[PDB]
């Protein structure tokens, strides 16, 4: 929702940095000589940076050794195909994706090879455990930049993620429009929290991810990306328990579009049922168990299987957990619909209150000057004769006598 | 254009529900015993919902 407030970064900028280093003369030979004995090695390049190195396929020691003397049984044909197919598929994946592929496919790096790279990675055992149990997610957060094909090796860099922040508390915020419930059509006003998305504690502050679609979830673990995040103060959490706190100005979005919708949460469902829309919450055995009244309400997944709003049927998540309903007056009722700023996107609580004070200011001040600025006498008619003051008008003085 | 006015839903919620039902004990054996003869069958799970 607030994804526009994020910055713009270059993702593979690090890998490309290593990539251009391999273009230098002799740099590839250091790797070829390091991997001449074993299949995995550590190489410190010219710029001093140390990188892991891996040889996954050796067609040289096959074509030049097992295949060349015949060219100088049928099984040898199939054996070649099995050895060559990977080189073909790696080629195909590159030739489409313009040299940069993500996620890293199994052809580019098998699970055994990826677990080997994680095992030799220079980080803690906790990170090794995390990356080893969630290799599918690590693949989705990794890149494969094709570098060089120099005499006589093929090379591509696999840009792997480093999880510097682990085991800190996270929480996901879901929001939905909060409108009034009048009978007239255009008479309602609406308000919605825009800060929805993922939040995680990080270095005494909070990392906020407005595009929760980019954060991947496995069990209760959340793999987010700091590149598309925001570093907010710790006080941001107050917006959930006290939206009108002065120490943090919570962001909202105003409108007049009272449409009915539903937001499926992790353990329940929010239903904003406005207008003549019929919204229900149903159970797979009992049937309809709740008919929502006009307004924004909530229903937990404890015993509910479906939630229907209008012509839309949502299936709620059947995850195990305790859901608590916190009572409270909808804050939209705290506003007067006659001075409510209805065109606000990048807004906040204080911006709306200040536009209301400003809109209210001009009326009380215009009345404070104009009412009454007619308590004074105007200018007499500007003709030749003189005019005296009588009642509310300028009487011709010549009438005396 | 008005895509922001839309709600937020979980797409795979139903399939994942059936998935969590399939983790239960004996649930897989009912399927393996049902398909021991033919390749296609209709099976009613523990919660009564019938699935292909």
């Amino acid at each position, epitope marked *: 929702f607030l994804g526009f407030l994020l910055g713009v970064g270059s993702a593979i900028a690090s890998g490309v940095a290593v990539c251009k280093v391999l273009h230098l003369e002799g740099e590839v030979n250091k790797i070829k000589s390091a991997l001449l004995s074993t299949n995995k090695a550590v190489v410190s390049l010219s710029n001093g940076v140390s990188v892991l190195t891996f040889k996954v396929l050796d067609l040289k020691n096959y074509i030049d050794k097992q295949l060349l003397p015949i060219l100088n049984n049928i099984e040898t044909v199939i054996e070649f195909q099995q050895k060559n197919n990977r080189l073909l598929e790696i080629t195909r994946e590159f030739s489409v994706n313009a040299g940069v592929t993500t996620p890293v496919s199994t052809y580019m790096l098998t699970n055994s090879e990826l677990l080997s790279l994680i095992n030799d990675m220079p980080i803690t055992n906790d990170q090794k455990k995390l990356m080893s149990n969630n290799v599918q997610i690590v693949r989705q957060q990794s890149y494969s930049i094709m570098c060089i094909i120099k005499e006589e090796v093929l090379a591509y860099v696999v840009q792997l993620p480093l999880y510097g922040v682990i085991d800190t508390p996270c929480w996901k915020l879901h929001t939905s429009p909060l409108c009034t419930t009048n009978t007239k059509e255009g008479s309602n006003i609406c308000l919605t929290r825009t800060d929805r998305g993922w939040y995680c504690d990080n270095a005494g502050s909070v990392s906020f991810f407005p595009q929760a679609e980019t954060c991947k979830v496995q069990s209760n673990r959340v793999f987010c990306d700091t590149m598309n995040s925001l570093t907010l103060p710790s006080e941001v959490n107050l917006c959930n328990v006290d939206i009108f706190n002065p120490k943090y100005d919570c962001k909202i979005m105003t409108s007049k579009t009272d449409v009915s919708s539903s937001v499926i949460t992790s353990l329940g469902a929010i239903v904003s049922c406005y207008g003549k829309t019929k919204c229900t919450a149903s*159970n797979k*055995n009992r049937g309809i168990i709740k008919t929502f009244s006009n307004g924004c309400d909530y229903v937990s997944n404890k015993g509910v299987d479906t939630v229907s709003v209008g012509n839309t049927l949502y299936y709620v998540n059947k995850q195990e957990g305790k859901s608590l309903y916190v009572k409270g007056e909808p804050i939209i009722n705290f506003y007067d619909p006659l001075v409510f700023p209805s065109d606000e996107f990048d807004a906040s609580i204080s911006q709306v209150n200040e536009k209301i004070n400003q809109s209210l200011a001009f009326i009380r001040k215009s009345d404070e000057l104009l009412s009454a600025i007619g308590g004074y006498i105007p200018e007499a008619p500007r003709d030749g004769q003189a005019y005296v003051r009588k009642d509310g008008e300028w009487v011709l003085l010549s009438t005396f006598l | 254009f008005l895509g922001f006015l839309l709600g937020v839903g979980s797409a795979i919620a139903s399939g994942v529900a059936v998935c969590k039902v399939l983790h239960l004990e004996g649930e897989v054996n009912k399927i393996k015993s049902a398909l021991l003869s033919t390749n296609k069958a209709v099976v009613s799970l523990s919660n009564g919902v019938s699935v292909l």
Partner: antibody
Amino acid sequence: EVQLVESGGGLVRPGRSLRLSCTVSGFSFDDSAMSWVRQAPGKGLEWISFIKSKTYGGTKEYAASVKGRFTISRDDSKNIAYLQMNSLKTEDTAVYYCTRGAPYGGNSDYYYGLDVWGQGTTVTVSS
Amino acid sequence: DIQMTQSPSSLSASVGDRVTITCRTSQDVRGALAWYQQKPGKAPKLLIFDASSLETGVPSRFSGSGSGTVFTLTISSLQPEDFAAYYCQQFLDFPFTFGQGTRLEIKR
């Protein structure tokens, strides 16, 4: 955190009256519905009464065995639920438990079980 | 009222055995069955709600099944803690009548 403490039991003559009081502590009392279930010595569980939340009216639902004799009520101002027992018989001698009805969702007038249970209070009716 | 009938009333079983209690109703309760565990003198504990849904904090060995008229509670691997009384309750309409009860004893 969540607790139901029923009180007011003890000895009472057959044909007299006794008022049980269930104090709720740990959650919102106004949003939740309360129920009374008793267990006679040696016998199984018997459902007695049920009072809905304020949101869904104030409907008191009793069982056939005590309908017309017992009366359930609630005081949301002090988070308490009463069970007024009138015209007591000797068969009413039992352990009285205070329970919370679990709505089929976060808030719904359909209940799937009795969530929280009090520890119970013993009521002996004998002359 | 809706009639509840539990079978059997008494059950003898050892530790690690697989037991199944049955609750028959008179009408179609639309899957509004509840299973409770009551140890002698102590308050009952809600084990299973809806038809098969498990209450939070209940071990995985407790399974609920059945539909319409017949409902089954199953304990896969018995433990010394599971020897108690078990009651089924209907939640279709009032009254929320209870079941007969099932005493679960240690076989000897």
